[PDB]
Design a protein around this ligand. Structure first.
Ligand SMILES: CS(=O)(=O)NC1CCCC1
Ligand SMILES: CS(=O)(=O)NC1CCCC1
Lengths: 263, 264
């Protein structure tokens, strides 16, 4: 791909692969989430990055706090999808990365995503506000006027998510990451949590419904030697409340909501 | 990609992605195996397929019996890899698909693969020899003279694999497939078995060695509701292992294999 003419956003085209599609021969939400991750990485590399020069010496990293994806049409196997991505400063709270998914042939928006990132010390795992020294290093790569993939005042991407009460209606227990679930730094890839959340959705729902919206809050990281329980309860179109927690102590790692539409 | 000038092989270029690399910032063997699978699919689509018209009528499918991969250099993140693939008839035994991996910049062969496919009834799971009616439908898309990715007279792609004896030196217990491990037909993707085999290799070996060769025999398919046990034993500068995947319950064999690793 490449940066746009103003250098304030990045675009990339992807051809949907055979192993990237589900039973309906269209890209899975995990394939979509991997593509957003890839275009985000290519945007950082194209402008020299993410971690700025100040973040590196201070052992600071950007970590995902919240992910929100809305899909209107899942691209078919062999189709070309164009993804446009950009970043925006959210003051001292952190940063935001947005995405727009379009069909390469028709030019219509087939999906959109937004994510909230927060600064964290790599070693102590302690959150912190964005300093001016850090802010000045990345602002020159962001639009200065607001540019939101989800502009709607009071919309699905900023709603509070409650904690699922025991007993859960559905559950998938004993989930463990394998080496394919780890990134280049040996941490569990954020897309694996989406897959784990979806494992407790019954197969009948997956077979008769399509996933329209998914919102995920990231509370704690899952280590390579950790075991996760996936819990789901219907709250309703079908809506579900989700919870990932450690198999042992029951420590929360994620919470989320999904909205599905009848095929 | 596209078929070559003679239409007897297919080539495709891939840029290695961020989430496709391991700790060394190079493509994993599972990424490589997915790319071979994708180029094989695009080859069949480009010539009108890989079930023929007769195979669809008789509920017959091509299933993998053996996979053999040898990697000399794993492509780095952001690198372009070119993969050339072709098929060859192995008489009435079945078919073979071979691959050649090359660096797009240097043009050098960085890896190669071969696989044995056998005809099976989709419903009864019963193997069968390739009939003349089926053979004539795909022969016109194959080279007639032999073209082997592993030509050597004493190559490791045709060696017999023994069954691992209990107790195993290493093991990874309770492995279950998730929805991302399934293909478009809701069957476990063949690349998941490679990942499962590698889960019983200790992390220290993965951190100090690079995987050079992997040979896998496919004996039985793992269902979506099955649980697998991965067993490994060292048999050996270079390290060799004997592998076995079996069902967690009854201990029914699903796969057996061997891996060869070299010191980084
Ligand atoms: C514009 S960018 O996403 O490539 N760079 C990042 C912005 C937040 C910190 C670095
Ligand atoms: C050209 S191809 O790879 O699609 N040929 C195949 C041989 C087995 C059946 C199809």
């Amino acid at each position: 791909g490449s940066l746009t003419e103003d250098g304030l956003s990045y675009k990339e085209k992807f051809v949907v692969r055979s192993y990237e599609v589900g039973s309906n021969k269209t890209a899975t939400v995990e394939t979509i989430a991997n593509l957003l991750q890839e275009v985000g990485c290519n945007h950082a590399q194209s402008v020299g990055f993410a971690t700025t020069t100040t973040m590196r010496k201070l052992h600071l990293i950007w970590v995902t706090a919240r992910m929100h994806i809305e899909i209107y049409k899942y691209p078919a196997w062999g189709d070309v999808v164009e993804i446009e991505t950009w970043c925006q400063s959210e003051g001292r709270i952190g940063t935001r990365r947005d995405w727009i998914l379009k069909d390469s042939v028709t030019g219509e928006v087939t999906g959109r995503a937004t994510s909230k990132w927060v600064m964290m010390n790599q070693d102590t795992r302690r959150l912190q506000k964005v300093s001016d020294d850090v802010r000045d290093e990345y602002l020159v790569f962001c639009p200065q006027e607001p540019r939101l993939a989800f502009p709607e005042e009071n919309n699905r991407s900023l709603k509070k998510i409650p904690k699922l009460e025991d007993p859960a209606q559905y559950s998938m227990i004993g989930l463990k990451p394998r080496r394919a679930d780890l990134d280049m730094n040996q941490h569990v890839n954020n897309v694996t949590y989406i897959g784990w959340v979806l494992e407790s959705i019954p197969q009948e729902i997956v077979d008769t419904h399509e996933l329209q919206v998914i919102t995920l809050d990231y509370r704690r990281e899952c280590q390579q030697d950790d075991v996760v329980d996936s819990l789901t309860t219907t709250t309703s179109d079908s809506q579900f409340l989700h919870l990932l927690r450690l198999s042992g102590d029951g420590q929360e790692i994620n919470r989320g909501t999904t909205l599905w539409r009848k095929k």
